[PDB]
Design a binder for this molecule. Structure first.
Ligand code: CDL
Ligand code: CDL
Ligand code: PLX
Ligand code: PLX
Ligand code: PEE
Ligand code: PEE
Ligand code: ADP
Lengths: 107, 347, 320, 140, 98, 48, 57, 459
């Protein structure tokens, strides 16, 4: 069996490279310290500072487009009217039956 | 061969196709078919070898038989009505014979057997011409007499073509056989909408022709005729492999690529005529074509296969002959989905 | 106007350029024989063009600049390692032989292109023909396996079935002990280790197969060491003989056009030198292939097309 | 042609078990003969006697498969007193598949046949009820 | 439709079936093609002469000529195939397989 | 440590004459690298 | 035993994907396994022509 | 809506023209800015919707999904920047291009005023994911996974297209607004049953349903970190969005046809939660947890009540964030260990305390600890199911118990105990990984302050 026991000419599997050995304060972003540090700075500024804070404040102070306070005030005035007039608060029929034309059975 | 002789033969083929397309007499259509078949053989036998000669003789036998039955159908139609104009076929026995003749000319099932054999025998340029240009005349004749075809027979042949192409493409390691079975499946898709809308047939023909041109030109550029030979392409021109993978995804019908446009529209059209089962079966079958396209893409660009030592020398040379229309073909076969309504131009 | 179908159509015919002096000739001999000097003298005397024997980096001399590239970027083999340990574990011997045969094929294509384009004759050292004899010796000495010679036979057939054999083959015959004496007198330490069995095997494979097989389609002029010193007699023999038994008289204008289209576009010339048959001596891993290709791309004038490299000094890139 | 289709369809589902079984057996025999002819044309196994034996085996199996399906579907429809129910066709088709598996002598083949032609028979019954068209004419 | 036309179509169908039988001798395939052509010529001539379609008398001869040209081509191809094998047997063409 | 890439054995699957070989098709040989196959003057005795 | 191996790894795998793969492989092998003899293909074409003439009219 | 789409398209030219060592910084900065821009879509109305034009419209169901999709890209880039260090500039730019294309397709899919356009983009999202899985994957099985992740999807999606065009032939419009306003009841017919199935199974396959969940463990295990993040966080929610959009026309046939899928989901949640208990792979366990959560979401959508829809939306958002965090933590372990096995590396809390805290928070938020939005969605779905039928509570409680069990099992096996002795390459966690964990977790605890932002249109 004169076979070399090598299936093919292949590069050896390289070992893992440590970002901490060649450069402490490595930040795990890049092997170039300056680019690494700037990547960290922009990530922290645009993630935690800009989006996480300003966006949270923007969402917190969004205008009442869902009409929650409007609905509450409408219900307040409507209940004030019906209680004073003696009406039985909310009616059972959502639409006035006078304008609904039932089909007569005659069965 | 002499370049002048080759140019004359190519012009003769084109003139025969044009004569089929522009003539209103059945005898002239038959004459155009005869001229095209007569001028096609030396193009198939440009490279002299037993394989090319065998492919050419198989093609000659099949096309001669198809032309002969075409002539018989014309004769029967004349017998039952003294008409030579290409119009409604009148007789039903001459309309079934006119359908099988055009089916063998196109390569539809069950007359599909010769396509993989002839495509494998001939070279890549001959295969390109055979699979692209040789479909214009029979499809034109079918479109002219579309209202006369019995939907049952045409739909049966189209469904059989789709099934046969999808199943037969799974077992192929040769690229030319893969292309032939792809052509069979695309022809099956093409003829399944003829009874309903010929515009969809022509749109599918245009899209298929563009995709096939791009694919065959990419195969010519990276001169490989097998899966393993194509697997070495990444080591020299990886961009060719990437474009090839994108094109293959396009022919698989995957959106938003161009190849999704025909199928979609065809399905849409066939949903207008209260037909539901057949389009669903067609899509489920085209899944097989997409499968073997994806296997080819796996072997081509998405993985890096082992290479050879001598390839290094090929790194030092550039292709002397370059194809001008390849980028345009790739772009048209990949990124024209947003331009779908242009099909109203009656392409 | 680069040569092609249009040039052949309009004016370009290669039959009118033949002036009975082309006469492609190869000169063949054992290791360290005086084949090179005789070939150079023949080329000078007959007005032909000499081609130095193809080496490891012959292809590097024809692409980009003439300076050869790195060994791992071009060839990934060395003759010195073959001489030191011909039984190397990495299969360097067959890698060397395959690269040498491919280089010989490229050189033959170049010579045929020059002959068909200018009509001037060409003189060559060992061609694709006679490249097998070394292989045979490397088989018989145990340096390579039978799969190696099988793959070599496949590639050699699929490549050499498309060319025209040389008009005249010139052989110089020298006894093995004299060749060994010349090896000792050369002084190169690597060639001193060549055993007499290997040289004897090459010299035997020459006479046994080469000479009878190309005596039926070419004209052979066997010469000894003494009678090869004078080029006058060799040129006289060349001019006296007339070739009518080879395939060359049967060629015509269209065959020459096909051959000229074949010899140009070296990518298809070398197309079958990398057939997908996996022999461990020549196959290369995906990671190594990617790394070496990336390194080759980073070379100065190899990233883009020859005329589109800015670092080399090409200008007007944006308007070519 | 469609003569067998007319003969099978004209018979009411809830009556004439024997006539339905005969029609289904005829259809199965014709289909098996067609399959045998295709197999012989594409693959001539060894000889004339082997070929005719193969054709007879295939024809008997298909006719046999058809006979089992017709008898079971009609009987289920009659005893269940609920005609035009795809469940009866499912039961008949899967019984036919079980018989096909018994002929082939394979438990997995039998179960797969039961499932895959019970579903097919149910789909055909649903299409007959709802008027689905496999080969739709050009409406528009 | 008289019985003569039916018999001519029957002859054409028999020739086509013989072409599709393929016992051996690709020459027999060519012969079946030529028999189909002869039946077509006979039927076309009879139909055209029966109806006094004066101009359609151009139709048969043209067909004949074209078919003969086709035949010539086929013959040439057959020769080349034989030139590789030494015989025109059909089964020799098994190098290409689906 | 490194991403897996196909080795020789993974490549040998795609090198057959057809995919999914069977007993009947195991003997099929793939076509030559170039589509050229091996190819594998009469005498007369005019007597008296 | 039941949740991980019996159902998730075996039977759910057997039903949809593996059965489809096996059926497609078998049909592809059956369809593509043609020896290249034009006699069989021509006989099949004759049978198909006869079936079309006797079934679609 | 183009104010979001056009910057996403301009992200491509910027990446290609970017310096060879500045691609990540530019991509991250501009992706975060685009997320800030897309934050404006949260301002919805109690009225119909935010109809920008004829082609794109917004809704309080689409808005949280769009915000999450825009937010995911910077996290994906930060996670992918690690393992692509030894990779050529062209291919890194190609990876970023695939991520940008996926984000653009998802953004256009979530607006999709018309159903055919929705289908086109919903199936266009497939190609970049398949390329990412089959190209930048480590194991040899990735190809197989890709095939699965492809064909399953198409096996469900091709019939849907047919149904879609059929509807346009009958209804005359596939626009969502006209479809809602002109909806008509479905008669209980075989044809309507099959149209229901064609409309439903396409989205059920991608959730995935318990029967059709095979592709998900393979796709999640063999994909890279970015692929796993995008699959777990956003790509699974496409089925839920499609179901909530398309169930309007399926009534009243939904009541009868929901039973098989309801049973399958209610039992498959238990099956997958139990499968999580016996698992030797972190990624597989996270994938099966995702399957369980999406089965609960399927139950919610099939119940078809307002509380069901609210809980479903909240659960999709919370599960996306939680699964992305879990996959990121598992990848951080794998990059040091290179084995991807739970039992191999142990006692990591001793060596990496802050990462142990991140693990604890991720496990707690996956455990549905109140008042997290995970618990809000789970509780809303549970209450809706109890209203649907009082017996579902047994299965729901069993699922909660097994979920807590396997979550704490995952935490304890990897963080607690004694460290593996022979492993010595466990370096301190980088700032990038910790920032990734913080950016994953802070939005959850901020959204629990404003739940109505993610409760959908039925709030
Ligand atoms: C819409 C439907 C579209 C259908 C698809 C169309 C089929 C495309 C093939 C047609 C031409 C074949 C070809 O060029 O090779 C394939 C070609 C690849 O080129 P190639 O492989 O490098 O060329 C190898 C040739 O086989 C090598 O052949 P050659 O070098 O020996 O030939 C010499 C050359 C040069 O010709 C000459 O020398 C000129 C001399 C004049 C002769 C005078 C004769 C008059 C009597 O002539 C030609 O190449 C043919 C031109 C004939 C003119 C047709 C009008 O691909 C295409 O052409 C695709 C084009 C896209 C479709 C057409 C435009 C879109 C509409
Ligand atoms: C309780 C009142 C709080 C008021 C003060 C405000 C505090 C704000 C904190 C917000 C959350 C922290 C951010 C999460 C990432 C952790 C940061 C980190 O890495 O630590 C480094 C830092 C330095 O440590 P080191 O020595 O350098 O590293 C050593 C190792 O890391 C070794 O690490 P370790 O061993 O030291 O462990 C770290 C520690 C802390 O790390 C964590 O695990 C934080 C996880 C907290 C929640 C877990 C998720 C469950 C879902 C709850 C969602 C509610 C959020 C409400 C809104 C939040 C706004 C953002 O883990 C724990 O102690 C276990 C906490 C489990 C408590 C379960 C009870 C949950 C419900 C409580 C009621 C909440 C609503 C009240 C409603 C009714 C009353 C008005 O450690 C800390 O800063 C500790 C944080 C203080 C403990 C917070 C736990 C309770 C807060 C609940 C959420 C906020 C409630 C708002 C008002 C409540 C009234
Ligand atoms: C380290 C140890 C701690 C040290 C720090 C000590 C300080 C502790 C304080 C922190 C938590 C304690 C609780 C105190 C909460 C008070 C603030 C709260 O009231 O504001 C909330 C506001 O919070 C926001 O509403 C929720 C945050 C927004 C969420 C968006 C996430 C940011 C975008 C990032 C991308 C998104 C990714 C996920 C996709 C969805 C609710 O406000 P609301 O009662 O209602 O009305 C506001 C006033 N109005 C009436 C005028 C309208
Ligand atoms: C595999 C992993 C999960 C994948 C997805 C699985 C979920 C899909 C299952 C679809 C739901 C069931 C389909 C049809 C349900 C209709 C209700 C039916 O079951 O009830 C009876 C129906 O009776 C019988 O069921 C007849 C049908 C029997 C044939 C079906 C085969 C049974 C088992 C096959 C299962 C295989 C499914 C997967 C195939 C690939 C009621 O009788 P009837 O009042 O008269 O009919 C009412 C309907 N009408 C009004 C339209 C007429
Ligand atoms: C009507 C016809 C319907 C056709 C339906 C097509 C379904 C799409 C999948 C097609 C795959 C068929 C090919 C196949 O399976 O080959 C077996 C192949 C052998 O591997 P090779 O790489 O080819 O070679 C190895 C030896 N060197 O097995 C595999 O690897 C398959 C692995 C991925 C399977 C893909 C998943 C398919 C199942 C998903 C659901 C689709 C089912 C079909 C529709 C269901 C009905 C609604
Ligand atoms: C992950 C894999 C999941 C696969 C999903 C498959 C389930 C979908 C159902 C099967 C495909 C049906 C597509 C139909 C598209 C909707 C169109 C429609 O419903 O219109 C019906 C058409 O309905 C049909 O034709 C459906 C017939 C089904 C043919 C294909 C069968 C495919 C397999 C069926 C068995 C499997 C059933 C359950 C599958 C669940 C998936 C596991 C009305 O027809 P008309 O002729 O116009 O009516 C006029 C008279 N009123
Ligand atoms: N096919 C081959 N295989 C291996 N080595 C070869 C081959 N051809 C030439 N060589 C080597 O090339 C070297 C130079 O060739 P040679 O003619 O002997 O010297 P010189 O050029 O001085 O005349 C020799 O050492 C010879 O071994």
């Amino acid at each position: 069996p004169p076979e070399p026991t090598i299936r093919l000419q292949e590069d050896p599997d390289p070992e893992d490279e440590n970002l901490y050995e060649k450069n402490p304060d490595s930040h795990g972003y890049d092997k170039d310290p300056i680019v690494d540090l700037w990547n960290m700075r922009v990530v922290f500024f645009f993630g935690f500072s800009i989006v996480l804070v300003l966006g949270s404040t923007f969402v917190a102070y969004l205008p009442d487009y869902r009409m929650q306070e409007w609905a509450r005030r409408e219900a307040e005035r409507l209940v004030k009217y019906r209680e004073a007039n003696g009406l039985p608060l909310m009616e059972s029929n959502c639409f006035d039956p006078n304008k609904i034309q039932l089909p007569e059975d005659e069965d | 061969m002499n370049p002048i002789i080759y140019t004359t033969l190519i012009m003769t083929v084109m003139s025969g196709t044009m004569l089929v397309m522009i003539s209103s007499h059945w005898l002239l259509i038959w004459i155009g078919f005869e001229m095209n078949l007569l001028a096609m053989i030396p193009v198939l036998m440009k490279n002299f070898n037993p394989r090319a000669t065998e492919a050419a003789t198989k093609y000659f036998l099949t096309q001669a038989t198809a032309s002969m039955m075409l002539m018989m159908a014309i004769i029967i139609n004349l017998l039952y009505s003294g008409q030579w104009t290409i119009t409604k076929m009148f007789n039903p026995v001459a309309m079934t014979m006119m359908t099988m003749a055009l089916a063998m000319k196109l390569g539809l099932s069950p007359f599909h057997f010769w396509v993989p054999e002839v495509t494998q025998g001939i070279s890549l340029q001959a295969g390109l011409l055979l699979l692209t240009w040789q479909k214009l005349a029979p499809l034109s004749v079918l479109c002219q007499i579309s209202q006369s075809i019995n939907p049952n027979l045409m739909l049966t042949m189209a469904m059989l073509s789709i099934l046969i192409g999808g199943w037969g493409g799974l077992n192929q390691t040769q690229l030319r056989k893969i292309m032939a079975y792809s052509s069979i499946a695309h022809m099956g898709w093409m003829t399944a909408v003829l009874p309903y809308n010929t515009t969809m047939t022509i749109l599918n023909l245009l899209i298929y022709i563009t995709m096939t041109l791009a694919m065959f030109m990419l195969l010519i550029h990276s001169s490989a005729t097998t899966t393993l030979s194509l697997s070495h392409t990444w080591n020299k021109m990886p961009v060719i492999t990437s474009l090839m993978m994108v094109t293959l995804l396009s022919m698989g019908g995957l959106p938003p690529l161009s190849g999704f446009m025909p199928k979609w529209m065809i399905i849409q059209e066939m949903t207008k005529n209260e037909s539901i089962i057949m389009p669903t079966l067609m899509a489920m079958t085209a899944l097989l074509n997409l499968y073997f396209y994806m296997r080819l893409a796996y072997s081509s660009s998405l993985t890096m296969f082992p290479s050879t030592n001598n390839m290094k020398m090929k790194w030092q040379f550039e292709h002397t002959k370059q194809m001008k229309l390849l980028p345009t073909m790739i772009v048209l076969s990949t990124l024209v989905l947003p331009m779908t309504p242009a099909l109203s131009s009656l392409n | 106007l680069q040569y092609g179908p249009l040039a052949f159509v309009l004016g370009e015919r290669t039959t009118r350029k033949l002036t009975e002096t082309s006469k492609v000739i190869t000169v063949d001999g054992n290791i360290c024989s005086g084949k090179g000097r005789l070939a150079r003298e023949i080329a000078e005397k007959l007005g032909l063009r000499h081609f130095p024997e193809a080496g490891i980096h012959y292809a590097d001399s024809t692409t980009g600049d003439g300076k050869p590239l790195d060994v791992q970027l071009s060839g990934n083999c060395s003759l010195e390692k073959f001489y030191d340990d011909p039984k190397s574990n990495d299969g360097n011997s067959y890698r060397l032989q395959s690269w040498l045969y491919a280089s010989r094929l490229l050189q033959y294509a170049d010579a045929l292109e020059h002959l068909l384009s200018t009509g001037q004759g060409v003189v060559l050292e060992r061609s694709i023909y006679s490249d097998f004899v070394f292989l045979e010796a490397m088989y018989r000495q145990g340096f390579i396996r039978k799969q190696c010679v099988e793959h070599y036979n496949e590639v050699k057939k699929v490549t050499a079935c498309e060319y025209l054999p040389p008009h005249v083959v010139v052989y110089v015959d020298v006894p093995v002990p004299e060749i060994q004496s010349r090896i000792q007198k050369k002084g190169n330490p690597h060639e001193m280790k060549i055993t007499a069995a290997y040289l004897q095997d090459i010299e035997n494979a020459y006479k046994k197969t080469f000479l009878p097989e190309m005596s039926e389609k070419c004209e052979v002029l066997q010469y000894s060491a003494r009678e090869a010193e004078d080029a006058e007699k060799v040129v006289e023999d060349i001019e006296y003989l007339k070739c009518d038994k080879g395939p060359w008289p049967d060629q015509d204008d269209r065959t020459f056009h096909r051959l000229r289209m074949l010899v140009q576009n070296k990518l298809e010339v070398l197309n079958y030198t990398t057939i997908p048959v996996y022999l461990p001596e020549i196959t290369i891993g995906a990671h190594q292939s990617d790394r070496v290709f990336q390194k080759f791309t980073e070379l100065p004038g190899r990233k883009y097309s020859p005329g589109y490299n800015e670092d080399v000094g090409d200008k007007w890139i944006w308007l070519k | 042609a469609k003569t067998l289709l007319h003969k099978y369809s004209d018979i009411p589902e809830g009556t004439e078990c024997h006539r339905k079984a005969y029609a289904s057996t005829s259809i199965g025999g014709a289909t098996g003969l067609i399959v045998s002819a295709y197999s012989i044309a594409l693959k001539p196994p060894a000889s004339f006697l082997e070929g005719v034996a193969r054709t007879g085996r295939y024809t008997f199996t298909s006719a046999a498969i058809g006979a089992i399906f017709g008898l079971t579907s009609c009987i289920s429809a009659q005893v269940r007193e609920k005609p035009d129910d795809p469940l009866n066709y499912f039961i008949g088709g899967c019984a036919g598949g079980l018989t096909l598996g018994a002929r082939t002598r394979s438990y997995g083949i039998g179960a797969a046949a039961c499932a895959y032609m019970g579903l097919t028979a149910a789909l055909v019954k649903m299409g007959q009820l709802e008027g689905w068209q496999v080969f739709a004419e050009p409406k528009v | 439709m008289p019985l003569v036309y039916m018999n001519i179509i029957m002859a054409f169908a028999i020739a086509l079936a013989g072409l599709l039988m393929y016992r051996s001798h690709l020459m027999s395939s060519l012969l079946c093609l030529e028999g189909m052509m002869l039946s077509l010529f006979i039927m076309s001539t009879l139909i055209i002469l029966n109806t006094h379609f004066t101009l359609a008398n151009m139709m048969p001869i043209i067909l004949l000529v074209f078919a003969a040209c086709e035949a010539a081509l086929g013959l040439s191809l057959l020769v080349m195939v034989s030139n590789t094998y030494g015989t025109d047997y059909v089964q020799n063409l098994n190098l290409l397989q689906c | 440590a490194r991403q897996w890439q196909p080795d020789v054995e993974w490549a040998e699957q795609f090198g057959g004459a057809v995919m999914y070989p069977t007993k009947e098709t195991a003997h099929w040989k793939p076509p030559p690298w170039n589509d050229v196959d091996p190819p594998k003057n009469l005498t007369l005795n005019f007597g008296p | 035993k039941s949740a991980s191996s019996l159902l998730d790894l075996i039977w759910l795998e057997t039903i949809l994907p593996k059965t489809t793969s096996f059926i497609q492989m078998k049909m592809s092998i059956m369809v593509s396994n043609q020896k290249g003899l034009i006699k069989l293909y021509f006989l099949s074409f004759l049978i198909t022509i006869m079936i079309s003439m006797t079934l679609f009219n | 809506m183009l104010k979001i789409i056009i910057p996403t398209t301009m992200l491509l030219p910027m990446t290609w023209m970017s310096k060879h060592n500045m691609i990540w910084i530019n991509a991250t900065v501009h992706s975060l800015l685009i997320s800030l821009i897309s934050l404006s879509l949260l301002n919805q109305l109690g009225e119909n919707s935010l109809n920008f034009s004829l082609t794109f419209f917004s809704d309080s169901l689409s808005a949280p999904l769009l915000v999450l999709t825009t937010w995911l890209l910077p996290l994906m880039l930060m996670a992918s920047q690690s393992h692509l260090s030894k990779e050529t500039t062209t291919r890194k730019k190609l990876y970023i291009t695939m991520l940008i294309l996926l984000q653009l397709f998802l953004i256009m899919t979530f607006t999709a005023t018309e159903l055919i356009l929705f289908y086109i983009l919903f199936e266009a999202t497939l190609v970049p994911t398949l390329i990412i899985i089959t190209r930048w994957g480590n194991q040899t099985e990735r190809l197989n996974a890709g095939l699965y992740f492809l064909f399953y999807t198409l096996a469900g999606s091709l019939p849907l297209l047919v149904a879609l065009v059929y509807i346009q032939n009958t209804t005359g419009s596939l626009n969502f607004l006209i479809i809602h306003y002109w909806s008509h009841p479905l008669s209980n017919s075989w044809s309507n049953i099959f149209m229901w199935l064609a409309c439903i199974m396409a989205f059920m396959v991608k959730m995935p349903l318990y029967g059709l969940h095979l592709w998900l463990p393979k796709a999640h295990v063999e994909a890279p970190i970015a692929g796993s993040m995008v699959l777990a966080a956003v790509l699974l929610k496409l089925g839920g969005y499609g179901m909530m959009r398309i169930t309007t026309i399926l009534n009243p046939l939904t009541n009868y046809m929901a039973y098989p899928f309801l049973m399958l989901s209610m039992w498959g949640m238990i099956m997958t939660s139990s499968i999580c208990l016996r698992q030797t792979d972190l990624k597989s366990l996270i994938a099966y947890s995702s399957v369980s959560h999406m089965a609960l979401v399927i139950v919610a959508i099939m119940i078809q009540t307002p509380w069901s829809f609210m809980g479903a939306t909240a659960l999709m958002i919370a599960h996306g964030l939680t699964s992305s965090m879990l996959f990121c933590l598992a990848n951080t372990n794998y990059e040091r260990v290179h084995s991807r096995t739970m039992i191999l590396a142990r006692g990591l809390q001793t060596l990496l305390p802050l990462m142990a805290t991140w693990w604890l928070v991720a496990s707690l938020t996956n455990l549905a600890l109140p008042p997290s939005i995970n618990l809000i969605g789970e509780l809303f779905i549970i209450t809706a199911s109890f209203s649907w039928s009082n017996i579902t509570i047994i299965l729901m409680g069993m699922n909660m118990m097994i979920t807590a069990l396997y979550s704490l099992y995952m935490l304890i096996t990897t963080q607690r105990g004694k460290y593996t002795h022979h492993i010595n390459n466990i370096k301190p966690s980088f700032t990038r990984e910790n920032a990734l964990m913080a950016l994953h977790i802070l939005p959850l605890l901020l959204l629990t302050l404003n739940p109505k932002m993610i409760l959908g249109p039925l709030y």
